[PDB]
């Protein structure tokens, strides 16, 4: 037997939902999303990481010009400096003090650290949505773990569940993304092979272990200082190490909808966006026949206290006479009032207590106990605490609508104007008719 219902995409709020198959007593399921997940489908563009500038010992030739032994390496540069006269610790290196030259050469590589310290630049297309859901079915809690695509069916306790696709296709992730350890950033990173010096991506490689490197550090070799053997060079500092300071806040802290994020794999979680269709196909053996459950009569309701306190801040006591002992599903017909108890034990002529939540200033609502309805009416007193650590149970008010029963003032002022208007219209239509009757 198929039942299909929409639950808001809100994690940790238990939606009661009513299954009302003819010839069976009603069944109430309680549904609570334990987590929702958006795992993005993800393509690696490149690694960026700490460059290493590699500088061999400078070749210095005495008494003659060296020349550039030109080669292709990731940002290779070399230069010949003329008229050097370098000293070692115990003497001049060259024989003469003129016509010597130093060939200095340098190039850049990934560091050997780039296998563990790297940021990974990804293209992110769309997400394989997933869920984990608690349902109270046949009086026990059971956990169901569907992909939220609308096309994974999970069967557990012989019920078959199909969930999604969510009514919002929204995601925290932009088209291009970078990740570093636990953190992810939405980022329009530079093309591969096109990074500028000292910004993010001034060294690029297709994978951590790849032997390819593109580098644009603008390494410029400089003349060695007179009487010394060093190789001085100017270079834009590692653009990855700059970025690690300048990052700002990752998506884990900045994303909309109360979203949470993790990075193995790079899934987003618990985004409270839109709503999720959920469908249950449940066996005949789950239901009780409409005559086999208790039948109820002499229904009466009292509300010992009521407050619109987000937390089931109202309590109701319902008196009943029941035809037999048994277990009874309980539901609120008024969408503005949510009751905590999904089912209750019944026997004899007796009473039961329910706890309920609403935004209503005067809760005036219909409760269904076993196949059978009672009308509850109460006056609700405001909560004293201004803010709380959990989302509201219940649902938003009619705001323009569903004012208090004490809005009988609106009826009074509408009639106090409306009968004055009706008398003025009656008078005008009368004197129009008698004057029209004298022409």
């Amino acid at each position: 037997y198929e039942h299909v219902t929409v639950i808001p995409n809100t994690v940790g709020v238990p939606y009661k939902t009513l299954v009302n198959r003819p010839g069976y007593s009603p069944m109430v399921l309680e549904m609570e999303l334990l987590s929702v997940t958006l795992e993005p489908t993800l393509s690696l563009d490149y690694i960026t990481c700490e460059y290493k500038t590699v500088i061999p010992s400078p070749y210095v030739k005495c008494c003659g010009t060296a020349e550039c032994k030109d080669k292709s390496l990731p940002d290779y540069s070399c230069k010949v400096f003329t008229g050097v006269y370098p000293f070692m610790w115990g003497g001049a290196y060259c024989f003469c003090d003129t016509e010597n030259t130093q060939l200095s050469e340098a190039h850049v590589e990934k560091s050997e650290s780039c296998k563990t310290e790297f940021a990974s630049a990804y293209r992110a297309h769309t997400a394989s949505a997933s869920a984990k859901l608690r349902v109270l079915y046949q009086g026990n809690n059971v956990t169901v773990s569907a992909y939220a695509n609308g096309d994974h069916a999970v069967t557990v306790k012989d019920a078959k569940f199909i969930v999604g696709p969510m009514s919002s296709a929204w995601t925290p992730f932009d088209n291009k993304i970078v990740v570093y350890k636990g953190d992810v950033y939405n980022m329009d990173y530079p093309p591969f092979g096109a990074g500028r010096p000292g910004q993010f991506g001034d060294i690029q490689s297709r994978t951590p272990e790849s032997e390819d490197v593109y580098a644009n550090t603008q390494l410029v070799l400089q003349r060695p200082s007179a009487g010394t053997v060093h190789v001085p060079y100017s270079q834009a500092p590692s653009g990855f190490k700059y970025w690690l300071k300048e990052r700002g806040a990752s998506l884990q802290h900045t994303a909309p909808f109360g979203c949470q994020i993790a990075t193995n794999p790079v899934r987003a979680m618990n985004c409270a966006v839109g709503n999720m269709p959920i469908s249950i196909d449940i066996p005949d053996a789950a239901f009780t026949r409409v005559v086999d459950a208790p039948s109820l009569t002499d229904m009466s309701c009292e509300v010992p206290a009521c407050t619109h306190s987000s937390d089931f801040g109202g309590v109701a006591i319902i008196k009943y006479a029941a035809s037999k002992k048994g277990k009874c599903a309980v539901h609120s017909m008024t969408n503005a009032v949510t009751i905590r108890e999904a089912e209750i034990e019944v026997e004899g002529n007796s009473q039961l207590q329910i706890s309920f939540s609403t935004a209503l200033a005067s809760a005036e609502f219909r409760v269904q106990v076993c196949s059978t309805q009672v009308h509850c009416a109460a006056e609700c007193h405001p909560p004293k605490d201004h803010i709380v650590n959990y989302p509201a149970s219940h649902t938003t008010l009619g705001v323009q609508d569903i004012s208090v029963t004490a809005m009988s003032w609106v009826q009074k002022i509408t009639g106090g104007v409306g009968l004055v208007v009706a008398v003025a219209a009656l008078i005008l239509i009368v004197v129009l008719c008698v004057s029209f009757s004298r022409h």
Binding site: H253, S310, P382, I387, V388, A406
Partner: protein
């Protein structure tokens, strides 16, 4: 300010605190018209200043 949507505040390396408002007011419905106008005004100030 804690909006109707809720506020998440995270302080240092602590796990986040979440806060939501609720329907508290120093006015009351069920009283005289000035009590009930103040009640709906503290809960819904944008929609009440419009409709009245």
């Amino acid at each position: 300010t804690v909006p109707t949507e809720g506020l998440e505040v995270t302080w240092g390396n602590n796990e986040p605190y979440k806060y939501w408002p609720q329907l508290s007011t120093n006015g009351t419905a069920h009283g005289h018209p000035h009590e009930i106008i103040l009640y709906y005004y503290e809960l819904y100030p944008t929609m009440t200043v419009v409709v009245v």
